[PDB]
A paper describes a structure:
To provide insights into the structures, key residues of association, and multimeric state between the SARS-CoV-2 RTC’s cofactors, we solved high-resolution crystal structures of Nsp7 bound to Nsp8. The other structures were obtained from crystallization in the presence of protease Glu-C (V8). The C-terminus of the Nsp8 is well defined in Nsp7/8B, but not in other forms. In all of our crystal forms, the heterodimer formed between Nsp7 and 8 places Nsp7 near the half β-barrel-like domain of Nsp8 with the N-terminal helix of Nsp8 extended and pointing away (approximate dimensions of 40 × 40 × 46 Å). The similarity between all heterodimers in all our crystal forms is remarkable, with a root mean square deviation of 0.82 Å for 184 aligned Cα atoms despite different unit cell dimensions, different space groups, and different asymmetric units. In contrast to previously reported Nsp7/8 structures from other coronaviruses, in all three of our structures, either as in the asymmetric content or symmetry related, a heterotetramer or a dimer of heterodimers is present as an elongated, thick rod shape of 40 × 92 Å. The differing crystal forms show only slight variation in the packing of Nsp7/8 heterodimers to form heterotetramers. The heterotetramers are formed between the two heterodimers that are related by the noncrystallographic twofold rotational symmetry. Comparing the heterotetramers in the asymmetric units, the RMSD is 1.28 Å for 368 aligned Cα atoms.
SARS-CoV-2 RdRp, also referred to as nonstructural protein 12 (Nsp12), is the catalytic center of the macromolecular complex frequently referred to as the replication transcription complex (RTC). The RTC is essential for virus replication because it makes copies of genomic and subgenomic RNAs and polymerizes antisense RNA. In SARS-CoV-2, besides RdRp (Nsp12), the RTC involves nonstructural proteins Nsp7, Nsp8, and others.
Author numbering:
A (entry chain B): 78 to 198
B (entry chain A): -2 to 71
C (entry chain C): -1 to 71
D (entry chain D): 79 to 192
Write the structure that this text describes.
């Protein structure tokens, strides 16, 4: 299957070019994707726009979330909701080292791109 | 230096669109139109900041397609 | 080298897209030849092979007088 | 706006091509800037046939010497030359003083040397 060989070489060259660009946001989302943390909609660029992401396990949750803040694509995002693999609401208090085996992974985080400028305008 | 990356990121966006096309994204009419517009925006970008931010969106389309590409290239 | 390899392969994808926008797919025999050149570039293991095929592929574009302006040339 | 996109994609193509800094690609791009362009796919094998447009005497003298044509980092053995009316032209006719009397552009046919 020559078309499949070419596809594989084209995909490998793509990620070689991406790494050569050495952009922090691109590196972040590629490195997250490698761990199973992938987006579900197109990553938006305007403030307060909605992002949904898959979080596959507790280790990746702790590597990306602190409090109600999700760090991704060189930006901060305010977590609005977390639901589990059966689409049931999960409170952040439930996501602990001890309790995570009780959860239906992966979790789906919905968050809004954070804004630091004149928040009460 | 920066003009080097400008052409590099524009070249990369054409490959990204071609990889997405080969993954049959053209069958998703609305999604494919959004991919083409982002690719167009990158080619027409004025500075590396705008091009990189649009590439973030464009690349997130590929990254959402689990199993379509491997983690071995990630 | 390994970066020169990625750059030349990236360039060949752009060259084929430029030719597709110039309707070269409507010449089925010639388009088949362009795809085979691009495929061989993407599959090349050394820069010399990749550059030799790029010469052939680029010559398709350069043959099309009045399709690319002299400015970019 | 598709013309703006198309123009940007072609500018980037030639910027990347220049960045590759390959002599053979540089040679055919520069010749194309002067109007010396190929009529078939540039071949890569010994004795394979190439046809190119040569627009003017200065370009002719820039690329041709005796019966040798220099192009794409290779030497080519000139087999035949024709003018715009598809009439054969002898090399002895392509001279500083006589070129005003020829029907340019010329078309040179040549075979790759090994």
């Amino acid at each position: 299957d020559k078309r499949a060989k070419v596809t594989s070489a084209m995909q490998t060259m793509l990620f070689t070019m991406l790494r050569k660009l050495d952009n922090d946001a691109l590196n972040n989302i590629i490195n997250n994707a490698r761990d199973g943390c992938v987006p579900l909609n197109i990553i938006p660029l305007t403030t307060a726009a909605k992002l949904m992401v898959v979080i596959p396990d507790y280790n990746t949750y702790k590597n990306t979330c602190d409090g109600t803040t999700f760090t991704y694509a060189s930006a901060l995002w305010e977590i609005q909701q977390v639901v589990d693999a059966d689409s049931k609401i999960v409170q952040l208090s439930e996501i602990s080292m001890d309790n995570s085996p009780n959860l239906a992974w992966p979790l789906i985080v919905t968050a809004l791109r954070a804004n630091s400028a004149v928040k009460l305008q | 230096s920066n003009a080097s990356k400008m052409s590099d990121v524009k070249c990369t966006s054409v490959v990204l669109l071609s990889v997405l096309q080969q993954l049959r994204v053209e069958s998703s009419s609305k999604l494919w139109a959004q991919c083409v517009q982002l690719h167009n925006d990158i080619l027409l970008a004025k500075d590396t900041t705008e091009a990189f931010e649009k590439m973030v969106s464009l690349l997130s389309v590929l990254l959402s397609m689990q199993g379509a590409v491997d983690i071995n290239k990630l």
